[PDB]
Structure formats: C-alpha cells, structure tokens
Amino acid sequence: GFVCNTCPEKWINFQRKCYYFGKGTKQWVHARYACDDMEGQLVSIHSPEEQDFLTKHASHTGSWIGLRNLDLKGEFIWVDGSHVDYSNWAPGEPTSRSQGEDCVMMRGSGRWNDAFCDRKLGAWVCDRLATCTPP
C-alpha cells in the first residue's frame, strides 16, 4: 500500500513494473503466449527511462517486444491495448513498403525494427505490474 517494487522469482523490477528477460527460440505469437502463460504480457514501452532499462538487459541478438501493426497499414498497438506514445524506432522504421512485417523486435542497441511475425528470435521480454509493501 506504499512501495510498489515487489516482483516474482526470475523477474527484475524497474519503477512500478516487473520484467522477464526470456531466452529460447520463439516466433512473435509464441513469445506472446509465453508471457501470457507466465501472468505477464510482451513488454509495452512508454518512456525513454523504461527504454534505457530495457537496453541495459536487451539480448545482443534481438528480442520480441509487445508491438504489432493491427490494421495492416501503419497503426501499431501494444498487446495490453495501449497506443504508441513513446517510440524508439531505428532510422527509416517502420517501413511503409514492407508488407507482412507487422511484428516489432528490439535490437541489441534497444532500437526497434518491424519484422515478419514468423521470424524466430532467441529472446523476448515480458512485463507485469509490481506488487506493493504496505506502510
């Protein structure tokens, strides 16, 4: 009821959320359900502070994040239903003439790239809300 920084075992706290830096070869949808079945969601990024934390723990070979183009014409939404306010797209991204590249990955640099959803990445990040210690 005061300090919201408690996380489950294997999850790392940053501000009022918990992050799971997953490993294992998964397509976007596979990583989506891996987070879901673990009481989390693929990571939603809403500030440069949150992004800097992610970049610090980001897999050098790339990670799936919770961003997906839904209407197939440039409208990206996070798995939790939230819209893009903060963005950390790599230059030229997202590409307009890249039909099928609907799923978003985070590079070792922390910058985002759009991708074919059936692409197998060796890492993926989940998030959930932290629990709180009462006063």
mmCIF file of C-alpha atoms in Angstrom:
data_model
loop_
_atom_site.group_PDB
_atom_site.id
_atom_site.type_symbol
_atom_site.label_atom_id
_atom_site.label_comp_id
_atom_site.label_asym_id
_atom_site.label_seq_id
_atom_site.Cartn_x
_atom_site.Cartn_y
_atom_site.Cartn_z
ATOM 1 C CA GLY A 1 0.000 0.000 0.000
ATOM 2 C CA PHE A 2 3.105 2.274 -0.377
ATOM 3 C CA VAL A 3 6.226 0.839 -2.137
ATOM 4 C CA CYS A 4 5.381 -0.928 -5.417
ATOM 5 C CA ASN A 5 8.639 -2.742 -6.260
ATOM 6 C CA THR A 6 7.981 -6.423 -5.370
ATOM 7 C CA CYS A 7 8.427 -8.919 -8.240
ATOM 8 C CA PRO A 8 8.075 -12.720 -8.717
ATOM 9 C CA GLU A 9 11.148 -15.009 -8.790
ATOM 10 C CA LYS A 10 13.234 -14.501 -12.060
ATOM 11 C CA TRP A 11 11.567 -11.073 -12.783
ATOM 12 C CA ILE A 12 13.587 -7.768 -12.446
ATOM 13 C CA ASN A 13 11.952 -4.593 -11.074
ATOM 14 C CA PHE A 14 12.086 -1.186 -12.752
ATOM 15 C CA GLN A 15 9.830 1.537 -11.329
ATOM 16 C CA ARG A 16 6.323 0.037 -10.728
ATOM 17 C CA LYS A 17 6.763 -2.932 -13.112
ATOM 18 C CA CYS A 18 8.489 -6.354 -13.368
ATOM 19 C CA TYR A 19 10.381 -7.584 -16.420
ATOM 20 C CA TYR A 20 11.224 -11.058 -17.618
ATOM 21 C CA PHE A 21 14.173 -11.361 -19.967
ATOM 22 C CA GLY A 22 13.269 -14.616 -21.680
ATOM 23 C CA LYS A 23 15.518 -16.895 -23.722
ATOM 24 C CA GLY A 24 14.583 -19.585 -26.222
ATOM 25 C CA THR A 25 13.827 -19.591 -29.959
ATOM 26 C CA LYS A 26 10.273 -18.259 -30.474
ATOM 27 C CA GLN A 27 8.163 -16.619 -33.222
ATOM 28 C CA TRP A 28 6.308 -13.429 -32.156
ATOM 29 C CA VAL A 29 2.990 -15.199 -31.317
ATOM 30 C CA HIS A 30 4.898 -17.945 -29.414
ATOM 31 C CA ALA A 31 6.665 -15.260 -27.264
ATOM 32 C CA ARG A 32 3.213 -13.566 -26.807
ATOM 33 C CA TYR A 33 1.755 -16.727 -25.228
ATOM 34 C CA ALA A 34 4.966 -17.498 -23.295
ATOM 35 C CA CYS A 35 4.441 -14.114 -21.491
ATOM 36 C CA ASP A 36 0.667 -14.719 -21.130
ATOM 37 C CA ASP A 37 1.006 -18.210 -19.556
ATOM 38 C CA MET A 38 3.501 -16.671 -17.058
ATOM 39 C CA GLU A 39 0.922 -13.987 -15.881
ATOM 40 C CA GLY A 40 2.636 -11.291 -17.983
ATOM 41 C CA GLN A 41 2.472 -9.700 -21.436
ATOM 42 C CA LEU A 42 5.100 -8.966 -24.096
ATOM 43 C CA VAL A 43 6.709 -5.667 -22.957
ATOM 44 C CA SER A 44 4.995 -2.264 -23.538
ATOM 45 C CA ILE A 45 7.410 0.695 -23.690
ATOM 46 C CA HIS A 46 6.025 4.117 -22.603
ATOM 47 C CA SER A 47 9.074 6.286 -21.650
ATOM 48 C CA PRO A 48 12.816 6.776 -22.527
ATOM 49 C CA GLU A 49 13.665 5.759 -18.852
ATOM 50 C CA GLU A 50 11.844 2.410 -19.363
ATOM 51 C CA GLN A 51 13.679 2.006 -22.734
ATOM 52 C CA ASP A 52 17.148 2.685 -21.166
ATOM 53 C CA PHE A 53 16.425 -0.053 -18.563
ATOM 54 C CA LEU A 54 15.434 -2.476 -21.386
ATOM 55 C CA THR A 55 18.529 -1.601 -23.489
ATOM 56 C CA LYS A 56 20.723 -2.440 -20.421
ATOM 57 C CA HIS A 57 19.262 -6.026 -20.269
ATOM 58 C CA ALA A 58 18.491 -6.445 -24.041
ATOM 59 C CA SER A 59 19.787 -9.554 -25.845
ATOM 60 C CA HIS A 60 22.529 -8.590 -28.354
ATOM 61 C CA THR A 61 20.944 -10.981 -30.971
ATOM 62 C CA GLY A 62 17.420 -9.363 -30.754
ATOM 63 C CA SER A 63 14.198 -9.674 -28.699
ATOM 64 C CA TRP A 64 10.464 -9.657 -29.398
ATOM 65 C CA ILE A 65 8.569 -6.782 -27.803
ATOM 66 C CA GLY A 66 4.755 -6.297 -27.476
ATOM 67 C CA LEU A 67 4.218 -4.074 -30.523
ATOM 68 C CA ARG A 68 2.228 -5.213 -33.565
ATOM 69 C CA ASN A 69 0.664 -3.476 -36.588
ATOM 70 C CA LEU A 70 -3.013 -4.431 -36.474
ATOM 71 C CA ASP A 71 -4.887 -2.739 -39.345
ATOM 72 C CA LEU A 72 -2.028 -3.761 -41.749
ATOM 73 C CA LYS A 73 -1.397 -0.025 -42.750
ATOM 74 C CA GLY A 74 0.804 1.740 -40.081
ATOM 75 C CA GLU A 75 -1.268 1.570 -36.815
ATOM 76 C CA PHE A 76 0.851 -0.106 -34.074
ATOM 77 C CA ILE A 77 -0.697 -1.051 -30.745
ATOM 78 C CA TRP A 78 0.790 -2.749 -27.630
ATOM 79 C CA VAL A 79 -0.559 -6.205 -26.552
ATOM 80 C CA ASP A 80 -2.121 -4.599 -23.408
ATOM 81 C CA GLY A 81 -4.226 -2.446 -25.763
ATOM 82 C CA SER A 82 -2.255 0.775 -25.310
ATOM 83 C CA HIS A 83 -1.284 3.078 -28.181
ATOM 84 C CA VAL A 84 2.212 4.260 -29.144
ATOM 85 C CA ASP A 85 3.127 7.489 -27.342
ATOM 86 C CA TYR A 86 6.896 6.931 -26.755
ATOM 87 C CA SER A 87 8.772 5.362 -29.703
ATOM 88 C CA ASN A 88 12.392 4.169 -30.261
ATOM 89 C CA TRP A 89 12.268 3.194 -33.928
ATOM 90 C CA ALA A 90 15.578 2.671 -35.730
ATOM 91 C CA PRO A 91 16.026 5.245 -38.605
ATOM 92 C CA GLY A 92 13.634 4.602 -41.509
ATOM 93 C CA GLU A 93 11.410 2.344 -39.382
ATOM 94 C CA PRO A 94 8.612 1.401 -39.604
ATOM 95 C CA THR A 95 8.884 0.917 -43.398
ATOM 96 C CA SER A 96 5.725 1.588 -45.478
ATOM 97 C CA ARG A 97 6.639 -0.861 -48.392
ATOM 98 C CA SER A 98 7.317 -3.888 -46.111
ATOM 99 C CA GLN A 99 4.064 -5.880 -46.417
ATOM 100 C CA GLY A 100 3.884 -8.668 -43.782
ATOM 101 C CA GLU A 101 6.473 -7.113 -41.453
ATOM 102 C CA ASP A 102 3.854 -6.485 -38.753
ATOM 103 C CA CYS A 103 5.714 -7.596 -35.602
ATOM 104 C CA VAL A 104 8.275 -5.458 -33.721
ATOM 105 C CA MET A 105 11.674 -6.598 -32.386
ATOM 106 C CA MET A 106 14.205 -4.771 -30.194
ATOM 107 C CA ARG A 107 17.873 -4.821 -31.346
ATOM 108 C CA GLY A 108 20.918 -5.075 -29.012
ATOM 109 C CA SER A 109 21.031 -1.224 -29.312
ATOM 110 C CA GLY A 110 17.410 -1.064 -27.953
ATOM 111 C CA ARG A 111 16.102 0.424 -31.238
ATOM 112 C CA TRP A 112 13.036 -1.089 -32.850
ATOM 113 C CA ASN A 113 12.651 -2.865 -36.210
ATOM 114 C CA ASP A 114 9.487 -4.211 -37.770
ATOM 115 C CA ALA A 115 9.619 -7.891 -38.806
ATOM 116 C CA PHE A 116 7.833 -10.850 -40.288
ATOM 117 C CA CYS A 117 5.954 -12.390 -37.326
ATOM 118 C CA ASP A 118 7.139 -15.935 -38.144
ATOM 119 C CA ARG A 119 10.767 -14.875 -37.607
ATOM 120 C CA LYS A 120 12.422 -16.945 -34.809
ATOM 121 C CA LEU A 121 14.292 -14.790 -32.254
ATOM 122 C CA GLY A 122 16.396 -16.128 -29.353
ATOM 123 C CA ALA A 123 14.966 -13.650 -26.790
ATOM 124 C CA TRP A 124 11.691 -11.924 -25.787
ATOM 125 C CA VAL A 125 10.710 -9.606 -22.906
ATOM 126 C CA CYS A 126 7.566 -9.831 -20.661
ATOM 127 C CA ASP A 127 6.238 -7.292 -18.222
ATOM 128 C CA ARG A 128 3.721 -7.207 -15.358
ATOM 129 C CA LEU A 129 2.852 -4.801 -12.544
ATOM 130 C CA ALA A 130 4.895 -4.983 -9.348
ATOM 131 C CA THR A 131 3.251 -5.818 -6.005
ATOM 132 C CA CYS A 132 3.461 -3.409 -3.060
ATOM 133 C CA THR A 133 4.736 -3.441 0.530
ATOM 134 C CA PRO A 134 2.275 -1.691 2.897
ATOM 135 C CA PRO A 135 3.332 1.170 5.267
#
